[PDB]
Amino acid sequence: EVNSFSGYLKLTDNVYIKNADIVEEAKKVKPTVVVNAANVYLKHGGGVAGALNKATNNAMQVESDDYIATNGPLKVGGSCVLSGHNLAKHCLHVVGPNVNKGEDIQLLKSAYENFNQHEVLLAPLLSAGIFGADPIHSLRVCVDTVRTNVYLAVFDKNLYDKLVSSFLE
Ligand SMILES: CCNC(=O)c1cc2c(N[C@H](c3ccc4c(c3)S(=O)(=O)CCO4)C(C)C)ncnc2[nH]1
């Protein structure tokens, strides 16, 4: 079964959301594309990126180091397409702004625009958690920007409930 997403709540015609761990979603669904919440040097040291890398038994990190050696770092708001390993056909590494480190929140629109190069994606909420963006603002930018089919996995029931209530107001 291809892109077998289950238990999502449809918010708009192309944005769906679930209270779920993106790693467990990728193992079950084996989507065509999983989005990583990357940094510009593709160092997957913790958070979502560390969890996805650990689920590949460090194969994602070795591949990422080799991409950085040949191409240099990404820009904030940018992305690159690498292997999905055992989690997906492809991993789209997207760098949202880290507001806690002084990066511009306006780059969150550029970060979501990368999603439009892929017909179907499993993704986390960009710049949320320790990147410091307001997660309700990140959802609003996702809904206004992404035009392809995106399945958002948010691994926190408290935040999930706040995002759905914020959308349905
Ligand atoms: C147990 C293994 N899995 C995880 O640790 C895991 C954590 C996951 C997660 N976290 C969200 C998140 C979204 C973006 C984001 C960050 C965290 S960060 O702080 O790592 C860096 C910047 O970008 C939180 C808001 C809830 N969302 C989705 N699936 C998950 N899986």
From Swiss-Prot:
<feature type="domain" description="Macro 1">
    <location>
        <begin position="2"/>
        <end position="169"/>
    </location>
</feature>
<comment type="function">
    <text>Responsible for the cleavages located at the N-terminus of the replicase polyprotein. Participates together with nsp4 in the assembly of virally-induced cytoplasmic double-membrane vesicles necessary for viral replication. Antagonizes innate immune induction of type I interferon by blocking the phosphorylation, dimerization and subsequent nuclear translocation of host IRF3. Also prevents host NF-kappa-B signaling. In addition, PL-PRO possesses a deubiquitinating/deISGylating activity and processes both 'Lys-48'- and 'Lys-63'-linked polyubiquitin chains from cellular substrates.</text>
</comment>
<comment type="subunit">
    <text>May form homohexamers. Interacts with N protein.</text>
</comment>
<protein>
    <recommendedName>
        <fullName>Papain-like protease nsp3</fullName>
    </recommendedName>
</protein>
